[PDB]
Structures are given as structure tokens and as C-alpha cells.
Amino acid sequence: LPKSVDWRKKGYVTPVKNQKQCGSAWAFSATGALEGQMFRKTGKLVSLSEQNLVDCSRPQGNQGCNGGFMARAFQYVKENGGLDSEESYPYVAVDEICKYRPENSVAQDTGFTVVAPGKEKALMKAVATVGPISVAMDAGHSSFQFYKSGIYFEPDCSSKNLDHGVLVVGYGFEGANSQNSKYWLVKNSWGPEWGSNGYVKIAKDKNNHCGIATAASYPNV
């Protein structure tokens, strides 16, 4: 596999968004992954609607602003036959009436692929060969809230009890040795003001730090 990957440099990733006070990170993770797969399929980068997921995927087991899961979101897009654009179905950070319109759909998926649980090398392969990958992490730490630079490594992080959905857009390393000081490039949904322009480098190949490879998946388009 490549020594480093950054799908942002290839046009697969939209600018950083902000979930604000709504437990909808699972939806931004899911739209980010679908955004990269639709880009690979068609060459057009189109921002997708998180609000469409929040308001309409309760049947699949999501709970809108009270939490959800990316795989359930990809299941909804499949069962539903489509997903509207951010432009047509804007984000308001509160649970609202499902207003899904097929005529505004700009994405579709046939289901999703799961990355073998807990396997960082399997996630590395999915990232290198597919595009941005949705992942769950343990983000419940002041150190993550105030992250700014460097490889994030938090001793209190759990690899099994997770509470936040994010997007792995690549991986890399510091220095000239590609085999050490490795990290996952992660897109967050806390605004570009949080972290490093909305992103964070999470320690990679350090025993599945913060659970990045515990519940990783991507939509099939």
C-alpha cells in the first residue's frame, strides 16, 4: 500500500462542516464517505445532506440529533433509493420533518462494506484503495476538545467504548521513516475552527487508538 494517502488532495472531500448542538456526527461521517464515493464514480464533488439523514432514517435505527450510526445511514440511502444535496435539504441542527425529495437526489448506494473490526491494516487498505472511510472513535476527552496540532494520543482513550462518528481521509507519517510516527488523517464535524482547520492526526498503528478501526465502513456506489 502507499506510504501516505490524502484524499483531500484529489478532490474527494468537501470543506469542513459543523454539526453544532445536535448529536449528528454519524450523519456527517456518512455524508463524507458518500461524498468521496460519488466523486470517484462521477468526477463531481457535491455536498450531501446531513439533515436528510437526521430527519428520515429513524426506521433504520438512527435517532436524529440523539445519535445514530453510519451503517444505518448507508442502509437508509439504499432502502430509500437516494439522498438529497446539502443545498436542497439544508442543515438546521435539530430533528425535523422528513422532507426527502427524489428529484433532488444526487447520491445513491447499494449497501455498504464493513472493514474487519479492530484491524488497522484492513482500514489502511480500505483507505488506500477506496477513498475516505467512515469510522467511530472515542472523542469524549477534553484533550480532543482542545486538540490543535501534532499526533493526537490520549491514554484515557477507549478502543471499544466509542461515542463519535468521523471520516478518515488518509494517513501519513512524520519524518522520513514511513514506518513510525504514523497517523490517521481525520475529518471532524465541529467546524473548521476546531482542531487543525477541522482536522486531527490520530495516532496510527498504536493498538487501534481511540477505536478508529473498531467500526469502520463505506458505502457501495
Binding site: 454539526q19 448542538q21 448529536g23 456526527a25 469524549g140 465541529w190 467546524g191 476546531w194
Partner: peptide, 4 residues
Amino acid sequence: QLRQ
């Protein structure tokens, strides 16, 4: 998770 949310920004606190």
C-alpha cells in the same frame, strides 16, 4: 459526540 459534541463540542464542549
